[PDB]
Design a protein around this ligand. Sequence first.
Ligand SMILES: *[C@@H]1O[C@H](CO)[C@@H](O[C@@H]2O[C@H](CO)[C@@H](O)[C@H](O)[C@@H]2O)[C@H](O)[C@H]1NC(C)=O
Ligand SMILES: *[C@@H]1O[C@H](CO)[C@@H](O[C@@H]2O[C@H](CO)[C@@H](O)[C@H](O)[C@@H]2O)[C@H](O)[C@H]1NC(C)=O
Ligand SMILES: *[C@@H]1O[C@H](CO)[C@@H](O[C@@H]2O[C@H](CO)[C@@H](O)[C@H](O)[C@@H]2O)[C@H](O)[C@H]1NC(C)=O
Ligand SMILES: *[C@@H]1O[C@H](CO)[C@@H](O[C@@H]2O[C@H](CO)[C@@H](O)[C@H](O)[C@@H]2O)[C@H](O)[C@H]1NC(C)=O
Ligand SMILES: *[C@@H]1O[C@H](CO)[C@@H](O[C@@H]2O[C@H](CO)[C@@H](O)[C@H](O)[C@@H]2O)[C@H](O)[C@H]1NC(C)=O
Ligand SMILES: *[C@@H]1O[C@H](CO)[C@@H](O)[C@H](O)[C@H]1NC(C)=O
Ligand SMILES: *[C@@H]1O[C@H](CO)[C@@H](O)[C@H](O)[C@H]1NC(C)=O
Ligand SMILES: *[C@@H]1O[C@H](CO)[C@@H](O)[C@H](O)[C@H]1NC(C)=O
Ligand SMILES: *[C@@H]1O[C@H](CO)[C@@H](O)[C@H](O)[C@H]1NC(C)=O
Ligand SMILES: *[C@@H]1O[C@H](CO)[C@@H](O)[C@H](O)[C@H]1NC(C)=O
Ligand SMILES: *[C@@H]1O[C@H](CO)[C@@H](O)[C@H](O)[C@H]1NC(C)=O
Ligand SMILES: *[C@@H]1O[C@H](CO)[C@@H](O)[C@H](O)[C@H]1NC(C)=O
Ligand SMILES: *[C@@H]1O[C@H](CO)[C@@H](O)[C@H](O)[C@H]1NC(C)=O
Ligand SMILES: *[C@@H]1O[C@H](CO)[C@@H](O)[C@H](O)[C@H]1NC(C)=O
Ligand SMILES: *[C@@H]1O[C@H](CO)[C@@H](O)[C@H](O)[C@H]1NC(C)=O
Lengths: 177, 338, 48, 49, 617
Amino acid sequence: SKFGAISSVLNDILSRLDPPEAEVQIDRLITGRLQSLQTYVTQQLIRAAEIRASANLAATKMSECVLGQSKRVDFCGKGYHLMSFPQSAPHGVVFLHVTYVPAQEKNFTTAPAICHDGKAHFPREGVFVSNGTHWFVTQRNFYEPQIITTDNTFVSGNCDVVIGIVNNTVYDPLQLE
Amino acid sequence: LPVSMTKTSVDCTMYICGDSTECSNLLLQYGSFCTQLKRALTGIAVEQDKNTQEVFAQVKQIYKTPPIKYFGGFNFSQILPDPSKPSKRSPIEDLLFNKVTLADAGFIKQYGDCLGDIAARDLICAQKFNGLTVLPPLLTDEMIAQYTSALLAGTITSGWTFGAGPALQIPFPMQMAYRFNGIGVTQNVLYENQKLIANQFNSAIGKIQDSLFSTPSALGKLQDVVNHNAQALNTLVKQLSSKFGAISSVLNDILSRLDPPEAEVQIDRLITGRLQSLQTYVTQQLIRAAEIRASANLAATKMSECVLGQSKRVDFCGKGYHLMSFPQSAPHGVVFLH
Amino acid sequence: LPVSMTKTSVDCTMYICGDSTECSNLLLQYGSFCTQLKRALTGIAVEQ
Amino acid sequence: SKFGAISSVLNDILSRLDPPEAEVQIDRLITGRLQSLQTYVTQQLIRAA
Amino acid sequence: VLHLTQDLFLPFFSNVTWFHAIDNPVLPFNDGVYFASTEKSNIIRGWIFGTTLDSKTQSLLIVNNATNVFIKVCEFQFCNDGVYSSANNCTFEYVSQPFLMDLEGKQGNFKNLREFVFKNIDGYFKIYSKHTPDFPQGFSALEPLVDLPIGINITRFQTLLALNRADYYVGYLQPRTFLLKYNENGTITDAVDCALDPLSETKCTLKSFTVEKGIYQTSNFRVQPTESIVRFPNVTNLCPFHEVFNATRFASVYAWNRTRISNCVADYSVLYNFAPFFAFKCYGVSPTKLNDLCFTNVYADSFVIKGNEVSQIAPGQTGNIADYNYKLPDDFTGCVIAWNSNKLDSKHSGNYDYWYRLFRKSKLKPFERDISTEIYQAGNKPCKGKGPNCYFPLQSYGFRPTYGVGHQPYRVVVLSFELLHAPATVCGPKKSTNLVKNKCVNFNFNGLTGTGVLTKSNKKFLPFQQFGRDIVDTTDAVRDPQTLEILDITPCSFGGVSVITPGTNTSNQVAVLYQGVNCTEVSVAIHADQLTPTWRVYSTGSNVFQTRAGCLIGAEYVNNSYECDIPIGAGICASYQTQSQSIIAYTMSLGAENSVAYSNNSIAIPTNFTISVTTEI
Ligand SMILES: *[C@@H]1O[C@H](CO)[C@@H](O[C@@H]2O[C@H](CO)[C@@H](O)[C@H](O)[C@@H]2O)[C@H](O)[C@H]1NC(C)=O
Ligand SMILES: *[C@@H]1O[C@H](CO)[C@@H](O[C@@H]2O[C@H](CO)[C@@H](O)[C@H](O)[C@@H]2O)[C@H](O)[C@H]1NC(C)=O
Ligand SMILES: *[C@@H]1O[C@H](CO)[C@@H](O[C@@H]2O[C@H](CO)[C@@H](O)[C@H](O)[C@@H]2O)[C@H](O)[C@H]1NC(C)=O
Ligand SMILES: *[C@@H]1O[C@H](CO)[C@@H](O[C@@H]2O[C@H](CO)[C@@H](O)[C@H](O)[C@@H]2O)[C@H](O)[C@H]1NC(C)=O
Ligand SMILES: *[C@@H]1O[C@H](CO)[C@@H](O[C@@H]2O[C@H](CO)[C@@H](O)[C@H](O)[C@@H]2O)[C@H](O)[C@H]1NC(C)=O
Ligand SMILES: *[C@@H]1O[C@H](CO)[C@@H](O)[C@H](O)[C@H]1NC(C)=O
Ligand SMILES: *[C@@H]1O[C@H](CO)[C@@H](O)[C@H](O)[C@H]1NC(C)=O
Ligand SMILES: *[C@@H]1O[C@H](CO)[C@@H](O)[C@H](O)[C@H]1NC(C)=O
Ligand SMILES: *[C@@H]1O[C@H](CO)[C@@H](O)[C@H](O)[C@H]1NC(C)=O
Ligand SMILES: *[C@@H]1O[C@H](CO)[C@@H](O)[C@H](O)[C@H]1NC(C)=O
Ligand SMILES: *[C@@H]1O[C@H](CO)[C@@H](O)[C@H](O)[C@H]1NC(C)=O
Ligand SMILES: *[C@@H]1O[C@H](CO)[C@@H](O)[C@H](O)[C@H]1NC(C)=O
Ligand SMILES: *[C@@H]1O[C@H](CO)[C@@H](O)[C@H](O)[C@H]1NC(C)=O
Ligand SMILES: *[C@@H]1O[C@H](CO)[C@@H](O)[C@H](O)[C@H]1NC(C)=O
Ligand SMILES: *[C@@H]1O[C@H](CO)[C@@H](O)[C@H](O)[C@H]1NC(C)=O
């Protein structure tokens, strides 16, 4: 680009004008070519910062998901995280997140606490679920129907302050033996 | 949290040489100098659209609130959409949209009333006079509210299961009992003080509205964005009337009073000066765009973790032990209710 | 970990024109190429 | 640094040359000293982030 | 490579005027002429050029025969049919290989098309020819033939004929950006014009031949003004310049007579007539295009002065006169005039009337008069008189009819103009048009040249007001200099064109969006042919849509909802969807609508599970 001068070739512009008049010319060509380089450097700095941010994120993701199990949601993939594997790519890295996703679900029935005899019983972990006729206990993320027992429930309450309460009987493996 | 800023499409030749063929020809001598500027501005606009998408479009299926609103005694009417309002926005959304003033809406097609301004034409018309525009966002302020409502209705009827797999419904008292159990205190305490917890929830939700109403400016973070984006464009146009070393700031007068070579020397002084002032604005916009994208990445992470689940990391989702979080849309930003 | 840096408060008029009225007047012809600089420095200081 | 002018000090430039002739050289020095400052400000802005 | 050139070329799909031969009209010449001819063996000889085709302006001949050409730059007179009858000032002959190559495969069916294109950029006439054995649509390159420095004002283009016992295809080239596909061997295989279609302009910008699906922002449109209205001051008073330039007693430099020029129309042709220019150097204003200006006040100082002091007087000079008699401002917006006057300041026996200063206590500030008689002090004596150590300030400007060139009584008069933001009282002679409203028209209000849509305004313009602006200091309302009414000034029309297209591997249709402007404005102007874009997309009536993000032409509106494909703006997306295929505009669908079944005592808990492996880069 001429940048507003006689020519863009230095050996050409010199021989066709006297030195200082051609210098008035060479100084314009210089003050240009310098702006181009300055713009290049600034843009490279901005892209370098944007790349460094992603590199930091990739290092964190490697340490967290690859070297352990993470509880943060949607961090290491969609679903409940299990594990991940790294793969190298040109100028980058590729993660293979393994996640656990639930499946076919069925509406049953539910209740806050079961009142056997004036006392509210609560599941130690999981939910109270009813087939429709009988009451049971189970986990959260998988349905496995377990007979109601004194070891799967803990007692604290008075059967008069919880709303939605229902009636049924809770069994114990201690009175039988 | 800010999420995005205004999109701008500044134009080289119109800004620098108003419909002057000689000035355009002399600009052409600098090579591909402002094609870089146009590419940078296009990148900025695409980045803003991607930011808003990442923050808000976290759910593939939009849900709907149950027709009745009795979630175990908890009062929620301040956050779910109000059917009576034409815009279908919650009262908290309405206060937020009324407490922020935008200098340039963009989606106005103002062109056509500038002649009918009667009074002195405003800043928008002035910027339209010399080749600078503002593009409208792809996602309107109305469907952002729809996304927020879907996120809100997913939380209070299905827990956090809708954020991982299929949406499984569960009563709100039991969901709150599980959230209680997650922080290390048993569920029986909630099943004892259900009335107290509901009353405290309602009181806090009520008083947050008064706190936002009466405060002078609690939305300063969102307002600074529009303030800076306007006070940059103003100084870009106020610099169209600086001599830069020539004899006048009027290109027509320069080229209606002088002939070939002298017109040349003065037009060149003005081209160099107005090509700088233009190149300085793009770098500032690039740095500001990087800042806003970092702020949007933070907002996306906070939404995903606090809203679609319960977080254990301290002081991330608000001061204290975390239970819930509710999103609300704001102009060029998002607002969390921890 | 670094937390903050040094706050500078440069000024264009004294920097480019050592107490010279003529150089100040010539600088005045370039428009607002000084207010932006001062605003940037002030923002950096408040940010620190 | 002369920046293409005749002297790097703005004291003899206005003792060697009458205002208009000095202005020619004074404008050279001023554009140059207005850049250095712009570069400083831009690098500081980038380093702050 | 896909090297894109901005060069003089014939337009694509352009209109070639086909002729026939069984009388050889003259064709105008402007920015090159394309030529084509399909003939059996030969019916066309060559081409003549020049201006007026007479023995007064230089011409050219490319007349050909069996074995060579006859390139010559001559000034022939006429032939009216041995194709010329004058060779007086005729040199620069040239001989090379003949322009026509004819080959037949034992049959005349190989009718070769002989293309020719010429141009005279900075002289240097170039010729290009190629022979390919209504009009074929296959690409054929045009190998350059000869390139020699003609350097004549070529204005008229003609052609010859032959003798004997369906051709003449003439095109006209204009500067158009082209993009040419260079084959790996170095030939050219495909070319696209960048002023033909939206799709051609898109591929031209990205300099490629395949355009991926998406929306590309390419150029900007503007409504070109219909008319040009000029409003210059009601009066048409010629300035008293005549009185200034031909007085008989022009005051000398010491007391520079300053006259006032105001409330007049400034025509300087009379200035040209009343000036045997010998030194008309100008700095603040140029003298050629000077009558297109509206000056507020004009200052007309005249002083007779020597020949070298004519060079002395200039903005910011030095000397016995430039520093002690008449110093011009450094930022002088105005010019000086000097012509020799040896008939009015000269007489026999001498003439010592004039005076000049070489003795002043300090420098004379610009535009100041120091008429005074005070003897300069030398040393420390308070002496008041003439002689040694007591010098009289003024000296005689002695003039006689016999001097040298640098010592003649040169008559100098200066003009000072104030071309600033102020109500001008002195303008140039023009015809003031009428006023057209609600229509983009070039305006020339008292020298404030610009383009904009005018209208009536309900402003409260004070009696002393003339203009109005914003905090951005751009002129907004300019008081009609005649109808004393307030007139808003809009930027006519300025926007941006974006082209929505599916991949060219799929289809070639396009749709055009005019950014930030409503289509009622552009539908009027496209019908009146005033748009800067020449590419003209179809408008059936079913394909117009007012989006909040602009206004879209060429796509239909379908109310259905889909996942976004090509984001346009303001919640509108367009896509290529089967009807059998076309381009439609629809609204975004946020997601598959779903509703949950919340109840007081209902829970759904999963019975099974799946294992999914995702990826992240
Ligand atoms: C209640 O839950 C019971 C699970 O123990 C289901 O009863 C089963 O019934 C079969 C015979 O029909 C028994 O052989 C078996 O031992 C088991 O008890 C019962 O289907 C379920 N009821 C409903 C309505 O889901
Ligand atoms: C579960 O069964 C309890 C008896 O074992 C019920 O308590 C009774 O409540 C009635 C009033 O509703 C009293 O009149 C009676 O004396 C006894 O206290 C209890 O109501 C019942 N709950 C449900 C939900 O069925
Ligand atoms: C939930 O909380 C709402 C507060 O926004 C209650 O609305 C109030 O309704 C009263 C009149 O009933 C108004 O005077 C008041 O300004 C406010 O709008 C709403 O009643 C309440 N509902 C429930 C079921 O708790
Ligand atoms: C310069 O000389 C001019 C010509 O004498 C003066 O202009 C004219 O002077 C005549 C004198 O009869 C007036 O009648 C006429 O109206 C016009 O003014 C001019 O005044 C004079 N100026 C100076 C500053 O000397
Ligand atoms: C849980 O879901 C699995 C698939 O997601 C089921 O496995 C399938 O088993 C069938 C045969 O039973 C295969 O044909 C199929 O390819 C797949 O392996 C699995 O049976 C299912 N289990 C339950 C209890 O529903
Ligand atoms: C349970 O029944 C309700 C009643 O309509 C239904 O809406 C819901 O989808 C069901 N849940 C299942 C089948 O998992
Ligand atoms: C040019 O040709 C095309 C069609 O051949 C069309 O635009 C029009 O008929 C022609 N224009 C003329 C003859 O002015
Ligand atoms: C064509 O004209 C040239 C110029 O006189 C001559 O040298 C040549 O022999 C001619 N060719 C013919 C007559 O075939
Ligand atoms: C022939 O014409 C050229 C073209 O301008 C001219 O320069 C030259 O003087 C002419 N030769 C004469 C007049 O003898
Ligand atoms: C005619 O050609 C000469 C050759 O250089 C050129 O100087 C001149 O300007 C041309 N005529 C016009 C009117 O431009
Ligand atoms: C003064 O005016 C007369 C009018 O007849 C004109 O002929 C004459 O040329 C003028 N004087 C000069 C010096 O032009
Ligand atoms: C100027 O002339 C126009 C046209 O004759 C007339 O309508 C208008 O009133 C005049 N303006 C003034 C201020 O005299
Ligand atoms: C475009 O649409 C109509 C018709 O032209 C009118 O409102 C106005 O001209 C434009 N719209 C706006 C909001 O200015
Ligand atoms: C179909 O589109 C028209 C406008 O194009 C709209 O008025 C109408 O409501 C739409 N119908 C449906 C069912 O969306
Ligand atoms: C839940 O119980 C409350 C209070 O008894 C009642 O108002 C509401 O209608 C019930 N909802 C359903 C879905 O049964």
